């Protein structure tokens with residue numbers, strides 16, 4: 001038993017809700033919240049900008065130190081940093097950005113990072129400003145992640161569409 005509430009069960013291990021991931025994190029304080037990161041951990045907009053704003057820019061300050069030490073992430077890769085006031089840990093995962101020409105096949109590699117964590121609160125990778133089809137992203141998630149994932153979808157119209165079209 002865990003503290004996530006109001007989710008629709010899609011499979012044995014994947015759950016979905018129309019919710020703002022920032023507010024969901026603030027209330028649940030999950031062990032892991034996933035950020036929709038870029039390789040530079042520049043949290044300017046989308047999910048990343050919203051999560052970073054909720055930490056009063058502490059996420060960005062920590063991320064800048066991480067990059068100064070380690071260099072950029074790989075597309076499809078991840079790193080674990082602090083969850084600040086939102087979660088114990090933040091798993092920063094880089095899905096491909098279709099608006100940068102990145103290979104959509106890397107989306108499966110990105111979701112594989114979730115399997116290192118027993119339970120996660122997450123967005124749909126490569127959705128939103130990353131330009132991928134969120135329905136495809138949901139399919140890859142369900143076919144790749146084996147751990148327990150609670151997906152927060154901000155947009156209500158898209159949520160309804162994701163549910164109604166789910167096979």
Ligand SMILES: O=C(O)C[C@H]1CN(c2ncnc3[nH]c4cc(F)ccc4c23)CC2(CCC2)O1
Nearest residue numbers: 020021036046047050123127128129153154155
């Ligand atoms: O509607 C979606 O869920 C898909 C979109 C948006 N996203 C989010 N997912 C959950 N919570 C959110 N809160 C936000 C607050 C913002 F200011 C901006 C965006 C989000 C957001 C995920 C993405 C992929 C990156 C962008 O695509």
